[PDB]
Every structure is written in C-alpha cells, then in structure tokens.
C-alpha cells in the first residue's frame, strides 16, 4: 500500500519505488536526441563543469557500444557505468553468436529486461538511469530509443531526458518536422532546444557535447563534434535569434 | 464530554490540567499513573467520548480493600484542589479517525472549565533521533506561545532542551520549520490546536523505545518535578529516592503471567 | 531477532547516521570495557611485554583457568581485552588463520600480517547485516626477523596499527598518556625496564600496588622468541625489584 519496496503495489496499482527511481533523472543533466533523414545525434549538457575537473575521456555522457550504436545516460552515474558495460557485453555476445552486429532495438530490449529485473525482485534497488540510444541497422535504418529506470523503452524521432525534459519535448514537438529533417537542421534544432532549456546559464560550447551518427561509404561513423564546431553552431543560433528579433 | 461523579461540576477555576498522550511506550500514561498515585488524587469525573477503545477494570490505585472495588473506565479525571491540580488518565488506545475529534472536545472542555494551563506528558520515537539527539538528554519540551506566564524564564533557568523543529515538508531546500513529534500520538494535534485556540499548553516528553518503560516513566515524572515541584526536590534526601513516587498496585504482572511448568 | 534490520541511526551495523558514523561499531568499542580490565603492551629494545589485570572475584573459581594471555602461534602471544567469549573466539580464529598462513606460504606468520588478517575479518563483520563486531581488542606481540619486537593492536572496527606501547580496557587513555610520557624520555629499555614500565603503567593508572596473583605478564625476547607467560615467582621477583627502588 506504501512505498518502501519495489515489490509492493499501492491500492491503486502504483509501484512507488519505481516512480521514485524515475524521479532521480529529473535532477540529471539534459540529454537530447534527434533523428534526421541522414543521421542521428545526441546533445548532452555537461553537468560537471567545475574549474579543477580534468579534460576527460572523449565524452562524459556519450558512450560507444558497437561500431553502430552510441548511448547517452542521465541519472545516477555509477549505475550508468554498470549499464553501459553490460550494453557493450550484450552487443558483443550477439556479434559472437550471429556474426552480425546487434540490431538497435534488440540491445535496448535486453538492457531494459535487466532494468525490469531490478524493479521486480525484492531487496535490489532499481537503476536510477535513463538512457538514450542512437544507432543504425540494416532493418530500420537510423533509430533513436529511450529507456527509463523501470525497463520501459520506446523509439522516438526526437526525445529528451534529464533536467527540463518537458520544456525540451514541447519545443521539439513544436519544431521537429517529420520527414524534412536533415542533420544540419537537426543540429540547429538541438542547439535551439538545448539553449532554451539550459536557462541556468548561457549556452557555450563547453557545457554541451554533441555526437552524430551517420553512414559514410558503407560504414557507420559515430563522431563527437569538436569544441570548435559546437561554437560555430552556437554562433549560427545567436545570429539567427538576432535576425528573428530585429 | 466531561461527566461528573456527583451531579455537579467540581469548579476547576484556575487548575493545571495534567494529561497524557497515548504515545510510544505508554510513557505519558505510566507517568500519569505515578502522579495520580503519589499525590493521592481523588476521582472527580469521567471523560466520556467516542474516541478511545472502551475498556473497564476495578480501581487501578487500590490501597485498601474498601476502594479496591471501584470501577474504572478508559478516560477518567482526578483532582487535587489543595494544589489546584486536575489530572486526566487515558487508559486505552484511539479509534481510527477519532484522535482529532478527541482533541477538540478536550480542549473545548479546557477552555470552558476554566483551566489555566495544560501539561501533556508524552514520548517520541528514539530510533528517529539524529546525530545530535543521540548525544543529548532524552527529554524535550514544547511551550505554546501563550504559555509565557513567567514560565519561559523558569524553563530557561532549568536548562531544558526544546523539541527540535523539523521542516514541514522535506525535499525543499527552503525547509519551512514546524514541530513533529513522531510517535507522540495526539501530542502534535494537541499542540497545534492549543496554539490555534490560545491555550497555555506545555509538552514534556522523552525519547523512548518499547519494552519495560517504567524507568522512562520515572524519568519523565522527575522532569516534571524539576519544573513544578509536585514533590520534594530530588537529591536533597538521604537517598530516600525510589521511595518517593508511589508505584500503583496495578503495576503488577507487567510482563504477563506466570511461567508454565515443564519448561526449565 | 529472526531477520531484518533494526531501523535507527545507531541500531543496525549497516546504517550510517546523518554524520556518516557507524554507531554499532562504537558501541562495540564500549563493549571492550565490559569486564573492567586494562591491558598494557610495551615494546623494548629486544623484547615485547604484555601485562594485564587478573581479577578473580570468586573463592570457588579455579584461578588457573582465568587468563587473558593466549598463544596464537609458537612465537606470537596476545592479550585479549573485552567480552570473554568474544575474546576466546577471536583467539581461535587467529590460531586458524596463522596455521593457514604457515600452510600456504611455508613460513610462520608475522605479527603485522596476523593483525591484518584479523582486522580484514573484522571489517567484513562491520559491513554486513547478518554479523556483528566482536566486543574485544587484540594486542599481539612477537619478534619478527629483522625488524625486532612488535606490538600490534586490532580493534572491533577492523582497524589495526603497530605501536611502541599500547593499552586497552578501562584505563586506556590514562595508560596511553603515561606511556607517551615514558617514551618521550627514552625508549631503549633493555628487558627489565620494559617489564617495569608495563607494570608501573598498570599500577599507576589503577593506583594499585600489585600482587603476583593480581597480574599476568607474557613476554617474547630476541634471544628467546617463543611466547612465555611468567610464573607467579617471576612476577613477584619483578614486583619486589620495583618496590626496592
């Protein structure tokens, strides 16, 4: 009736501990994913922005899982480390058995089965991690999935997780054009949204990391944009907002 | 409501009402037994309400065979007009959704009957004591804003510790502060309603757990006796302590009944 | 008792308090004082001495069975302070772990490695919800090979450390101050001077002039590395030699 365990339903059928697990992400940094006609992207807010923090691994939030997929976590960081390790393992196990790269939804489904197992057996805290997956496979092409602590995934054409995900989702839903998106327009929309939802500070190409996925000559190219390109995108947005004002 | 024993109200003109709360360990109720027994107070009425599970038994303060057969119900009022003291003793547990109605009925009686002060003897959960409260004294107090009739200075001179104000709703960094006596039962309801009604209430409590809670009751009556002097002040005697609160005869077989044979 | 964790900041071993303190471990440290006995261990130039109170409050009790000095290996002895059964069980565990070390590594366990092993086990007790710390303190002595005398003190939290002199029990703080004052002056006590130091610490912080039957003394020496427990005649000789001076 109450909310002390994951293995207890309230008398209206609510699993309150899972709902609290899902409440931990709303604190975490804003991760944004946008699907285009020629690629996918992940725009993530650099939450750890202290002065004495070191220049780190190629990305704080963006993780490579295959040759073909990348993820972008939001939530508890240690749970996220465990989960990305297991994602990479699952993908290499599929490749070992079938000699083909794992399709994107099968990887998402496997991880979400793991997360649901932690929301079902008692005496195990669920994973306070909401992931955001981008990939390519020969079945459905460019794909973008989302996952939440309950092991509950879904495929999107543009979604956001983390802090201010609702304002970002409203803005995407207003501005995302289905079918007429290219990767440059998706990057413009990503900067615009990730600007209006990071209103604790002014957007600069040191609090955002952007990774794009494309296909070039029969190979997938997961590429994390360099700091000198995100600045050019931010300038393009600022000049656009100046023009649209007056 | 208050029902007298003799078709006449006893005129509690400026009396101090001592009452328990049905709190963790029954420490408030056990302390009230100690006070009523030691002061040798005489029953003056009943507090008949819908709010406490009904119970009945003969005189819990029997001393002679004459008065050992006096029936008692779950809520009974005792008095000592020499010291202008009136005492309530709740001997039961509250019925679901009925604690608040009892609190408004009781406080309406306090305002109508003319009682000056109210003193609530209570307790709280000691498993919820934080870092500091573990290394402090078990006893805490609360005074409603009206209760200032030169007793704020007295309590200050006694070097007592006020009940710590927790934040009304957690998870908010602003943390608006209001009292929270977890396991005090009606203690918080009584405090809030006294503050609303402008009644001089004091709450004295101890952080206790459950089990043999007779040491806790004796400690709480010694706290109250530091304040009120309802008894000769503590370590002033040739250690005639342990003989200075009269244990009621009903405090017998407190762990149940006798040991069955063929075990041990 | 069956199972579960008691709710409260000081009522289960695996609960932190708001200040990040494990209070059940500190309550185990208070359990060390359950017994009312103090132990002194003093390290010298070529010897280590453990000295403990021997209270036998019973005419009917066979006094040769009351002892807190134990032999872990042939060359390591310890004085246990705290709850008596917990002390004897931790001695049994130390004995087993020392035998395993000799089995695995082909040479006899050092003192630091034995206290490290016992403290690793104690840490495991503090982290899990089924077990509890032992309310006891182990002070180990031995002669190593090339370091010299060793006095080590494991404790209920899983902490261990080597010392030049240490105390456990009721008068641990008073004895520690006494030994600090003694060690600041000079430290190369021969063998007699270490025994006099340990006995004087115990008999000063307790303000008790000792009898050979109110005190236990176990020693190791560089020339005689084997743990030895002095007979009452030897302790009485030390006490009369201390009194005459």
């Amino acid at each position: 009736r109450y909310d002390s365990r994951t293995t207890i339903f309230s008398p209206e059928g609510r699993l309150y501990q899972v709902e609290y697990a899902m409440e931990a992400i709303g604190h975490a940094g804003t991760c944004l994913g946008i699907l285009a006609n020629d690629g996918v992207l992940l725009a993530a807010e650099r939450r750890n922005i202290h002065k004495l923090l070191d220049e780190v691994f190629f990305s704080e939030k963006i993780y490579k899982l295959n040759e073909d997929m990348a993820c972008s976590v939001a939530g508890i960081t240690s749970d996220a480390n465990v989960l990305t390790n297991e994602l990479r393992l699952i993908a290499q196990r599929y490749l070992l058995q079938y000699q083909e790269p794992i399709p994107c939804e099968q990887l998402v489904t496997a991880l979400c089965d793991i997360k649901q197992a932690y929301t079902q057996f008692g005496g195990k805290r669920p994973f306070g991690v909401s992931l955001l997956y981008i990939g390519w496979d020969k079945h459905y092409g460019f794909q973008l999935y989302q996952s939440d602590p309950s092991g509950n995934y879904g495929g999107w054409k543009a979604t956001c997780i983390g802090n201010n995900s609702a304002a970002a989702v409203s803005m995407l839903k207003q501005d995302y054009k289905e079918g007429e998106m290219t990767l440059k327009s998706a990057l413009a929309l990503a900067i615009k949204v990730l600007n209006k939802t990071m209103d604790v500070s002014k957007l600069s190409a040191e609090k955002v990391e952007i990774a794009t996925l494309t296909r070039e000559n029969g190979k997938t190219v997961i590429r994390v944009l360099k700091q000198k390109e995100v600045e050019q995108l931010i300038k393009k947005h600022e000049e656009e907002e100046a023009k649209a004002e007056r | 409501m208050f029902v007298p024993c003799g078709e006449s109200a006893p005129d509690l003109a400026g009396f101090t009402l001592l009452m328990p709360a049905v709190s963790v360990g029954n420490v408030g109720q056990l302390a009230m037994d100690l006070i009523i027994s030691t002061l040798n107070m005489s029953k003056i009425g009943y507090f008949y309400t819908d709010c406490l599970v009904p119970m009945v038994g003969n005189n819990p303060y029997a001393t002679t065979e004459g008065n050992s057969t006096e029936l008692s119900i779950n809520a009974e009022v005792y008095s000592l007009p020499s010291r202008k003291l009136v005492a309530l003793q709740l001997r039961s547990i509250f019925i679901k959704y009925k604690s608040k109605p009892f609190c408004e009925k009781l406080l309406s009686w306090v305002k109508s009957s003319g009682c000056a002060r109210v003193i609530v003897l209570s307790s709280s959960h000691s498993y919820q004591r934080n870092d500091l409260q573990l290394r402090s004294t078990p006893f805490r107090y609360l005074l409603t804003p009206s209760m200032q009739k030169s007793v704020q200075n007295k309590i200050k001179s006694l070097n007592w510790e006020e009940m710590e104000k927790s934040r009304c709703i957690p998870e908010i960094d602003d943390s608006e502060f209001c009292i929270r006596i977890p396991g005090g039962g009606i203690t918080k309801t009584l405090y809030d309603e006294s503050c609303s009604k402008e009644i001089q209430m004091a709450v004295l409590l101890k952080f206790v757990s459950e089990g043999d809670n007779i040491p806790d009751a004796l400690g709480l009556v010694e706290y109250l006796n530091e304040w009120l002097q309802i008894l000769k002040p503590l370590s002033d005697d040739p250690t005639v302590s342990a003989s200075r609160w009269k244990i009621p005869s009903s405090w017998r077989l407190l762990f149940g009944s006798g040991l069955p044979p063929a075990l041990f | 008792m069956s199972r579960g964790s008691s709710a409260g900041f000081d009522r289960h071993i695996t609960i932190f308090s708001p200040e990040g303190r494990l209070y059940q471990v500190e309550y185990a440290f208070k359990a060390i004082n359950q017994g009312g006995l103090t132990s002194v261990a003093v390290r010298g130039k070529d010897c280590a001495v453990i000295v403990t109170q021997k209270k036998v409050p019973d005419k009917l009790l066979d006094s040769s069975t009351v002892t807190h000095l134990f032999k872990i290996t042939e060359n390591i002895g310890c004085v246990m302070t705290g709850m008596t059964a917990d002390s004897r069980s931790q001695v049994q565990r130390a004995r087993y772990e020392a035998a395993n070390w000799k089995y695995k590594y082909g040479y006899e366990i050092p003192v630091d490695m034995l206290c490290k092993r016992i403290a690793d086990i104690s840490q495991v007790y503090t982290q899990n919800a089924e077990m509890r710390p032992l309310g006891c303190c182990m002070i180990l002595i031995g002669i190593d090979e090339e370091q010299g005398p060793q006095v080590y003190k494991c404790d209920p939290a899983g902490y261990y450390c080597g010392f030049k002199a240490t105390a456990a029990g009721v008068k641990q703080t008073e004895s520690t101050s006494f030994l600090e004052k003694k060690v600041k002056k000079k430290f190369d006590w021969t063998f007699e001077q270490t025994v006099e130091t340990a006995i004087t610490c115990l008999s000063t912080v307790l303000s008790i002039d000792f009898k050979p039957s109110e005190i236990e003394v176990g020693v190791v020496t560089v020339e005689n590395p084997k743990f030895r427990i002095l007979t009452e005649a030897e302790i009485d000789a030390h006490l009369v030699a201390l009194a005459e001076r």
Partner: protein, 127 residues
C-alpha cells in the same frame, strides 16, 4: 554402467529448447582427469578447511565460517550481472592470491548469458 536411473519414476520434465544438447551417455566419465578437480575446487578446498577445523577445534568453527560465507554471498548482485566477491574473498583468503580462475576465461565477459528472470529464478530453486 552407472545404474541410478531414478527410473522408478523417470518422470522428470526438461525444457527442450533450454536443455541444449545433453548427452547423459557421456556425463558419467569426465572429459579430462582434471575436469571435476577444477570445477569443484573452491568447494573441495572449503570442505578440506571445514574438516580440519572440525577435527581440531570443533563444530563451531566450520559453522561460523559457513555462516559468514552464507551471509556475504547473499548481499550480492543478481545472477545475470557479475559480482566482485570482495567480502567473500576476504573471508576465504583469496584477496591476495591470483589463481587461474581469475585470469583465464574471464567471468566478467562471459560470451554467453541467459535471460535475467530465468537466471534469477533458477538461483531461487524454482527452475
């Protein structure tokens, strides 16, 4: 010739798709002399240690070791994810030795792992 066909009662049921390829014909004579010696090595080492503790010290010693082992192995990770056995190694004494189980055929990267719920409820004895 193993006898033992519980065949009095060979009524047991198996999951055909999950049993894989089982050949009880050859499951009576290990494939190598070292197969079982290595499969059950921590088991046999625990049994040897409990036996020496029993014979030298008494019932209490193996009981306390088994009780500690049972306790630490129970605040663990659900079977479809690899655990560290940090406390169990500290208890068993493997916190400072590396064997061949530690470096060969790493359990942390299994190359094959089952379904989460199937592996959890197999550990629970439910099949």
């Amino acid at each position: 010739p193993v006898t033992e066909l519980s065949a009095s009662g060979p009524f047991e049921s198996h999951d055909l798709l999950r049993k894989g390829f089982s050949c009880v014909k050859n499951e009576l004579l290990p494939s190598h002399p070292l197969e079982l010696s290595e499969k059950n090595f921590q088991l046999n080492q625990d049994k040897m240690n409990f036996s020496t503790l029993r014979n030298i010290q008494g019932l209490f010693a193996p009981l306390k070791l088994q009780m500690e082992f049972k306790a630490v192995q129970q605040v663990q990770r659900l079977p479809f994810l690899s655990s560290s056995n940090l406390s169990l190694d500290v208890l068993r004494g493997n916190d400072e030795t590396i064997g061949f189980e530690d470096i060969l055929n790493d359990p942390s990267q299994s190359e094959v792992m089952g379904e989460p719920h199937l592996m959890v409820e197999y550990k629970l004895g439910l099949l």
